[PDB]
């Protein structure tokens with residue numbers, strides 16, 4: 001809170017943090033895509049997709 | 056360089072050449088694999104094989120004659136080679152096999168022995184001749200459900216179900232007089248041959264015409280014969296080309312010469328004046344490739360074939376090759392065209408004038424059957440030299456630019472991308 005209750009210090013720091021997190025999410029999305037890339041997507045049959053891929 | 060051709064009751068075509076040592080005589084029919092059905096497919100090839108059977112072949116060997124036959128798409132030919140003096144004895148063997156023995160060659164002991172041989176023959180082809188196998192399937196998919204789709208050697212299933220009656224039925228419908236041309240090459244004169252022919256009368260099935268069909272058509276498509284056990288990938292890709300007797304017959308053949316053929320192991324081949332070579336040699340995208348402009352009666356195919364062990368870069372091979380072809384519509388240079396003219400003449404010469412009369416017969420026969428005459432080698436060169444960059448561009452902009460393609464391949468073709476990816480490369484983005 002930065003004080004006795006939710007006040008000015010609180011809202012100002014929450015805006016600063018609201019601006020920051022989306023960029024951390026962006027970095028996490030890249031890590032998400034990196035893990036996706038090494039094994040590729042799965043498919044509705046639940047089996048290997050290695051025998052028939054399309055670009 | 057003489058093209059003489061006259062008609063009495065039968066159409067006689069000859070091309071005499073003084074020094075030759077030997078003479079070749081034969082009949083060429085205006086019907087081939089393109090006239091067969093999906094079910095009697097392979098009958099023509101079967102005919103060729105009995106004509107060369109040990110029995111019929113031994114009868115000609117005693118007389119000192121050599122036999123040769125060729126089954127194509129638009130035509131079919133039976134040739135007998137002999138010394139310049141025995142030019143009459145070749146005609147005796149020709150008539151004796153197409154009228155007298157046109158029932159003795161079809162014996163139940165000869166037919167079964169021959170059938171068993173063409174079966175092991177066609178099987179061996181499908182099992183090992185990958186480049187031709189692929190080229191054959193290219194015609195199969197490109198011209199599906201149309202005359203040009205049928206393979207010349209026939210299919211194993213249509214062959215093993217073929218009987219003596221099928222041979223006869225085909226022979227009585229196509230080996231007619233109005234669908235034939237007697238050809239003579241070597242050294243013998245036109246007047247020397249026509250006399251021996253007009254001597255022996257007897258028409259035998261005259262006035263009879265062969266059956267008709269439906270016109271051939273190109274269909275953009277593909278057939279993928281994946282086989283990961285093969286050590287390479289063999290592919291053939293093409294667009295609808297030019298039929299024989301087409302105004303652009305030569306423009307097309309020149310266009311194919313621009314990219315020509317290649318062999319990565321031959322030092323001299325790596326040095327050719329072909330821009331595409333700068334791209335493919337860096338990572339060695341292929342062992343070999345060769346462009347072609349196949350022409351037939353109703354249609355043709357213009358494209359290339361290639362073989363490669365670089366299985367993870369097949370997409371670059373196809374991409375660089377198609378980018379070069381894009382150039383024909385927008386930026387082909389004067390010197391590329393000029394280089395092609397010179398090389399087209401050299402190859403066209405080496406074909407039309409070889410030291411083998413049997414090749415001459417096939418070339419002469421096939422031409423006269425379609426246009427009723429043969430264009431002289433000197434006449435061709437005049438047409439070739441007359442081609443301008445503007446001609447090639449107009450041709451390419453009609454046949455190559457943003458046009459459907461036909462693809463066929465076998466071996467390790469996992470790296471050959473989908474149809475649409477290849478098809479998209481038939482053009483370029485522009486403002």
Ligand code: HEM
Nearest residue numbers: 025026028029030032033035036037039040041042043044
């Ligand atoms: C901002 C959020 C996210 C982004 C941009 C994102 C993006 C992607 C993309 C592009 C794919 C591939 C296409 C697809 O399968 O839809 C994918 C796959 C996947 N994602 Fe996400 N993702 C996000 C959040 C999440 C969350 C919250 C979960 C799970 C708690 C998750 C689990 C997965 C899994 C398991 C796959 C593989 C699916 C499969 O192939 O079967 N993702 N994601």
